[PDB]
Write an enzyme that holds these catalytic residues in place. Structure first.
Site, PDB file in Angstrom:
ATOM      1  N   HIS A  45       0.827  -1.212   0.000  1.00  0.00           N
ATOM      2  CA  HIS A  45       0.000   0.000   0.000  1.00  0.00           C
ATOM      3  C   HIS A  45       0.850   1.246   0.000  1.00  0.00           C
ATOM      4  O   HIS A  45       0.653   2.118  -0.824  1.00  0.00           O
ATOM      5  CB  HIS A  45      -0.945   0.027   1.194  1.00  0.00           C
ATOM      6  CG  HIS A  45      -1.877   1.198   1.191  1.00  0.00           C
ATOM      7  ND1 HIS A  45      -1.456   2.478   1.477  1.00  0.00           N
ATOM      8  CD2 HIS A  45      -3.204   1.286   0.943  1.00  0.00           C
ATOM      9  CE1 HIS A  45      -2.483   3.304   1.403  1.00  0.00           C
ATOM     10  NE2 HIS A  45      -3.556   2.606   1.078  1.00  0.00           N
ATOM     11  N   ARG A  46       1.754   1.332   0.973  1.00  0.00           N
ATOM     12  CA  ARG A  46       2.859   2.320   1.006  1.00  0.00           C
ATOM     13  C   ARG A  46       2.515   3.718   1.534  1.00  0.00           C
ATOM     14  O   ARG A  46       3.423   4.495   1.855  1.00  0.00           O
ATOM     15  CB  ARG A  46       3.562   2.426  -0.354  1.00  0.00           C
ATOM     16  CG  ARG A  46       4.244   1.135  -0.790  1.00  0.00           C
ATOM     17  CD  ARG A  46       5.381   1.395  -1.762  1.00  0.00           C
ATOM     18  NE  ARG A  46       4.890   2.056  -2.956  1.00  0.00           N
ATOM     19  CZ  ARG A  46       5.654   2.528  -3.938  1.00  0.00           C
ATOM     20  NH1 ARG A  46       6.983   2.424  -3.891  1.00  0.00           N
ATOM     21  NH2 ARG A  46       5.075   3.105  -4.987  1.00  0.00           N
ATOM     22  N   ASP A  47       1.223   4.035   1.626  1.00  0.00           N
ATOM     23  CA  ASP A  47       0.764   5.284   2.234  1.00  0.00           C
ATOM     24  C   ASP A  47      -0.381   5.093   3.242  1.00  0.00           C
ATOM     25  O   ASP A  47      -1.362   5.825   3.226  1.00  0.00           O
ATOM     26  CB  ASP A  47       0.335   6.250   1.132  1.00  0.00           C
ATOM     27  CG  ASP A  47       0.183   7.676   1.631  1.00  0.00           C
ATOM     28  OD1 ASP A  47       1.118   8.177   2.297  1.00  0.00           O
ATOM     29  OD2 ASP A  47      -0.878   8.286   1.354  1.00  0.00           O
ATOM     30  N   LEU A  48      -0.244   4.124   4.133  1.00  0.00           N
ATOM     31  CA  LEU A  48      -1.251   3.913   5.172  1.00  0.00           C
ATOM     32  C   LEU A  48      -1.229   5.024   6.204  1.00  0.00           C
ATOM     33  O   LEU A  48      -0.198   5.310   6.801  1.00  0.00           O
ATOM     34  CB  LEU A  48      -1.042   2.569   5.855  1.00  0.00           C
ATOM     35  CG  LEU A  48      -1.326   1.384   4.949  1.00  0.00           C
ATOM     36  CD1 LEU A  48      -0.723   0.117   5.527  1.00  0.00           C
ATOM     37  CD2 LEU A  48      -2.819   1.221   4.752  1.00  0.00           C
TER      38      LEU A  48
ATOM     39  N   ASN B  40      -6.936   8.511   5.628  1.00  0.00           N
ATOM     40  CA  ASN B  40      -7.353   7.917   4.376  1.00  0.00           C
ATOM     41  C   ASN B  40      -8.449   6.891   4.572  1.00  0.00           C
ATOM     42  O   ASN B  40      -9.082   6.474   3.613  1.00  0.00           O
ATOM     43  CB  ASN B  40      -6.152   7.273   3.677  1.00  0.00           C
ATOM     44  CG  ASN B  40      -4.981   8.243   3.483  1.00  0.00           C
ATOM     45  OD1 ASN B  40      -3.841   7.818   3.279  1.00  0.00           O
ATOM     46  ND2 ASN B  40      -5.259   9.545   3.543  1.00  0.00           N
TER      47      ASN B  40
END
Ligand SMILES: O=C1Nc2ccccc2/C1=C1/Nc2ccccc2/C1=N\OCC[C@@H](O)CO
Lengths: 121, 266
Positions: free
Chosen positions: B145-148, B152
């Site tokens: 995912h890399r942007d938890l 969001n």
């Protein structure tokens, strides 16, 4: 390869208790046991994550087994209580990169030579 | 000036009711199918660059693939218009999904004035967030995912968590249909660790970290936070390891962690 040293096991009467232990020649993050009953798939049983002391069990043995480790994080202990014929198997100590995967599939880095556990009714 | 228009999207005819969210790349709108009366979220992403085109299309592909999970927003449809055809002079990508009740932070803001979050409610929020991430990590190959982050996350109409932001996600293309190597999953777990810390203590653990020494409310989570914030990624827990422990915590508190988070709905 890490060198494993296994103890405990053997025969016990149903409803009784056995303890296994396992020593590693160096530190690893996770240690557990899997077993294999005759004709069956390998079955991950219990696993401990050393730095957290968090511990993982299969559905088959949760509530009856307890995995724990020494203060020096070199050894794991498996206390097996309320043992049943279903628990007759060869029990193999193992290291793993993942205790949850290990408990589900017995995916291991390296495994010991095994100990026999037999439960009589 | 996009609201008020009725937009075709396949055989769906959708009236653009209002703006739910904005930001950089995109806007999100509430929309209503004129014919059926059914409601949706509609994300419109505008692009003047081929690189943005790739980013946008990749996000949509990720959403298509991951849809079908209780804790990911349901993908309904998507469509485009080339620059030759739009009133922006730009590439237009339309993404249609289930409409959610709101951003998670909005509900957290409102609960904030009723005490610290109940441990049970933190457990339900986090378990559901982690089940979504596990769904990505279980794909073959795993989707990272890399942007938890908590901003969001959404809450569905049924009071469950929904992950919606797949614009930073990545994976390996042309994967044979053997490797069991870590490929970035562990960064996701770190991010999750920070979320758990945040949900409990209402601040970020870094600006080394420190769990409040006399916390007796969220004690049950303490070891999991530390375990998820291992500096060493091999020592850090996998999502399976995290979820396993979350189920044991749930059992210990006699909580169904998959159930609607109805305390957030009052
Ligand atoms: O119901 C929804 N389905 C979606 C699918 C993709 C993206 C957003 C949404 C969404 C949203 N429903 C609502 C309701 C109130 C406010 C914001 C909001 C939404 N998305 O907001 C997007 C911001 C988020 O991506 C933060 O990074």
């Amino acid at each position: 390869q890490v060198q494993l040293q296994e103890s405990g096991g053997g025969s016990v009467q149903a409803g009784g208790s056995l303890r296994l232990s396992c020593g590693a020649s160096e530190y690893t993050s996770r240690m557990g046991w899997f077993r294999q009953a005759p004709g069956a798939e390998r079955e991950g049983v219990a696993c401990i994550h050393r730095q957290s002391n968090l511990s993982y069990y299969s559905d088959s043995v949760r509530g009856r087994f307890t995995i724990s480790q020494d203060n020096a994080k070199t050894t794991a202990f498996l206390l097996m209580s309320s043992l049943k014929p279903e628990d007759t198997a060869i029990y193999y100590c193992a290291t793993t990169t993942d205790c949850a995967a290990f408990v589900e599939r017995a995916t291991a880095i390296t495994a010991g030579q095994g100990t026999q556990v037999t439960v009589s009714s | 000036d996009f609201v008020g228009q009725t937009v075709e999207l396949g055989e769906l005819r959708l009236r653009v009711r209002r703006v739910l969210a904005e930001g950089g790349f995109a806007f999100v709108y509430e929309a209503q199918d004129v014919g059926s009366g059914r409601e949706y979220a509609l994300k419109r992403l505008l692009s003047n660059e081929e690189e943005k085109n790739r980013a946008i299309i990749q996000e949509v592909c990720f959403m298509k693939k991951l849809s079908g999970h209780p804790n990911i927003v349901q993908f309904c449809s998507a469509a485009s218009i080339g620059k030759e055809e739009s009133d922006t002079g730009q590439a237009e990508f339309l993404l249609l999904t289930e409409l959610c009740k709101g951003q998670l932070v909005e509900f957290l803001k409102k609960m904030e004035s009723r005490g610290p979050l109940s441990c049970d409610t933190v457990l339900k929020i986090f378990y559901q967030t982690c089940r979504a991430v596990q769904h990505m990590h279980r794909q073959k190959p795993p989707i990272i995912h890399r942007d938890l982050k908590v901003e969001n996350l959404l809450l569905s109409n049924q009071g469950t968590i929904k992950l919606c932001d797949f614009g930073s996600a990545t994976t390996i293309s042309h994967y044979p249909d053997y490797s069991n190597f870590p490929i970035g999953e562990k960064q996701d777990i770190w991010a999750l660790g920070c979320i758990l810390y945040l949900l409990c203590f209402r601040q970020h653990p870094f600006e080394k970290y420190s769990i409040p020494p006399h916390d007796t409310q969220y004690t049950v989570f303490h070891s999991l936070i530390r375990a998820m914030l291992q500096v060493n990624p091999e020592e850090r827990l996998s999502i399976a390891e995290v979820v396993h422990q979350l189920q044991e915590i749930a059992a210990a508190r006699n909580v169904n962690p998959k159930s609607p988070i109805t305390e957030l709905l009052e």
